[PDB]
TrEMBL record, chain A:
Component of the SMC5-SMC6 complex, that promotes sister chromatid alignment after DNA damage and facilitates double-stranded DNA breaks (DSBs) repair via homologous recombination between sister chromatids. The gene is nsmce4a.L. It is found in: Chromosome, Telomere; Nucleus. Belongs to the NSE4 family. Component of the SMC5-SMC6 complex. Transmembrane segments: none annotated. It comes from the Eukaryota. This is Non-structural maintenance of chromosomes element 4. The lineage of its organism: Eukaryota, Metazoa, Chordata, Craniata, Vertebrata.
UniProtKB/TrEMBL annotation, chain C:
This is Non-structural maintenance of chromosomes element 3 homolog. One of its GO terms (cellular component) is nucleus. The lineage of its organism: Eukaryota, Metazoa, Chordata, Craniata, Vertebrata. The chain holds residues 47 to 253 of 260 of the full protein. Residues 197-207 have a biased composition (Polar residues). Residues 194-207 are annotated as: Disordered. Residues 6-205 form the MAGE domain.
């Protein structure tokens, strides 16, 4: 006996978490902000001075 | 002379992600970083806190600078690069023709009396580029990126340099555009938006004009003609 | 080798690591040594060590090798990412939401998923590989190229299947930046369940 994963139930629950009839404009940002707490991603360093060739 | 610890690292990560932050948000970030990492929060030690970071960032040619917004008079902190070398040229944000257009737009902003470039002026600069040509749609998408990344500030289809851009490029502008960049007669720093003497052309920051002329017959500090603008 | 010139090289390596991380492409040790360390390559282990220590101490960043054979590195976070940690919410935030959904399907279905199964799921989230998306643009390129070059995903031909077909696995960067148990915790949270509800996946995440 294996606990089978239901991808259709999964997308239904994602859409609810994202805000339900259309998706709010911030739906993927909302999901991504939750997802970041499960990753160990580093921010990146960006600048303009010295980026010019040449 | 604190040892750099996780509160400093958390602060630096947040500032790296934002590029620039307003002063009241920075004070709140400092407090939150101390609480998140069990460091005793001292409201009176923000300068020391930033100073710890800057001591360690200095050999990386990075620093956390402070500046004042030309429009709003607010204090900003920005993580800025401080060197031009073979490694910094490996930055991958923008293509060569995109940065050519950025430089020509910056030049027009520096030259302009108002400190803003219009959409049409940027489209005309793009059409004059000697590099691979960009369509109108591509120019509009590039401008939206420059605004999103806080290199430009955009208002009704007009663009000026972001505070972040002035903070990082202050000395680059002074040297690359020494013939044309406005140097405030009061504080001697680059001015993008300014009040100009209409007789002799010298510039003052709007905040510096309010201070210097704070007087019922105000006169230009350079040519002594009466100041035409409102204080 | 003067200590001044070695110090300067260490700083250059740190700068190079930060700049080459800008789009989360992995960084080859051989490129650090060739392009930056140059005539100091006889002491490259010391120089990369000192750069690694600087990134740990100043930034809270960890250098990690994700391929032992080609010696390619990434930078991961030593600080726990939390709600309210001060980090900017931007377009890379939205991309991580999409990636997490894909990683979830792959892991929950036994650590491999056919490309067809991934697009079938994503269609219910109003994503189509061939239509520009209001958030992600070219999602076919984002999922099959960008995520793959970042090593978040593997994109592999299904062997011996005569009409060419592709399947997805987690990439080396996913195994270093997240974990099976963390993804199980995300899936459980979304579906208002406990991680131990998924007995099979829970055991896989423990080993
Ligand atoms: Zn001034
Ligand atoms: Zn005058």
């Amino acid at each position: 006996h294996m606990t089978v994963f239901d991808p259709t139930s999964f997308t239904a629950d994602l859409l609810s978490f994202m805000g339900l009839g259309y998706l709010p404009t911030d739906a993927w940002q909302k999901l991504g902000s939750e997802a970041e707490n499960y990753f160990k991603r580093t921010p990146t360093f960006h600048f303009m001075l010295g980026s010019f060739k040449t | 002379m604190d040892r750099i610890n996780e509160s400093h690292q958390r602060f630096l990560q947040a500032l790296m992600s934002h590029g620039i932050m307003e002063g009241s948000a920075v004070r709140a970030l400092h407090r939150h970083c101390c609480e998140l990492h069990k460091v005793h929060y001292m409201h009176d030690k923000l300068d020391d806190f930033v100073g710890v970071l800057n001591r360690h960032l200095q050999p990386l040619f990075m620093t956390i600078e402070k500046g004042v917004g030309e429009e709003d008079g607010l204090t900003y902190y920005a993580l800025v690069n401080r060197v031009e070398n073979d490694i910094t040229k490996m930055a991958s944000d923008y293509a060569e023709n995109e940065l050519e257009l950025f430089r020509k737009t910056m030049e027009l902003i520096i030259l302009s009396d108002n400190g803003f470039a219009t959409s049409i002026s940027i489209l005309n600069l793009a059409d004059e580029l000697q590099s691979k040509k960009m369509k109108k749609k591509e120019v509009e998408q590039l401008l939206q990126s420059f605004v999103q990344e806080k290199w430009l500030i955009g208002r009704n289809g007009e663009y000026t340099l972001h505070t972040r851009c002035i903070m990082e490029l202050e000395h680059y502008i002074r040297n690359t555009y020494q013939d044309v960049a406005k140097i405030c007669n009061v504080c001697r720093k680059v001015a993008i938006q300014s009040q100009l003497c209409e007789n002799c052309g010298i510039p003052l920051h709007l905040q510096c004009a309010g201070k210097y002329f704070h007087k019922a017959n105000p006169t230009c500090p350079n040519c002594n003609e009466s100041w035409p603008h409102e204080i | 080798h003067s200590q001044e010139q070695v110090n300067l090289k260490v700083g250059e390596v740190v700068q190079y690591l930060l700049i080459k991380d800008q789009k989360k492409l992995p960084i080859k040790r051989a490129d650090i040594v060739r392009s930056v360390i140059k005539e100091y390559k006889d002491i490259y282990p010391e120089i990369i060590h000192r750069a690694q220590i600087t990134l740990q101490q100043v930034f809270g960043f960890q250098l990690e090798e994700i391929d032992t054979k080609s010696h390619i590195y990434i930078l991961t976070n030593k600080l726990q990412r939390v709600q309210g940690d001060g980090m900017r919410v931007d377009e890379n935030t939205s991309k991580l939401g999409l990636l997490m959904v894909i990683l979830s399907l792959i892991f929950m279905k036994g650590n491999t998923a056919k490309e067809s199964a991934i697009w079938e799921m994503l269609r219910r989230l109003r994503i189509e590989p061939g239509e520009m998306h209001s958030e992600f643009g070219d999602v076919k390129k984002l999922v099959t190229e960008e995520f793959v070059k970042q090593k978040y995903l593997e994109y592999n031909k299904v062997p011996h299947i005569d009409p060419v077909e592709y399947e997805f696995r987690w990439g080396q960067r996913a195994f270093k930046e997240t974990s099976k148990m963390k993804v199980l915790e995300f899936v459980s949270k979304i579906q208002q369940k406990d991680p131990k509800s998924w007995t099979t996946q829970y055991k896989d995440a423990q080993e």
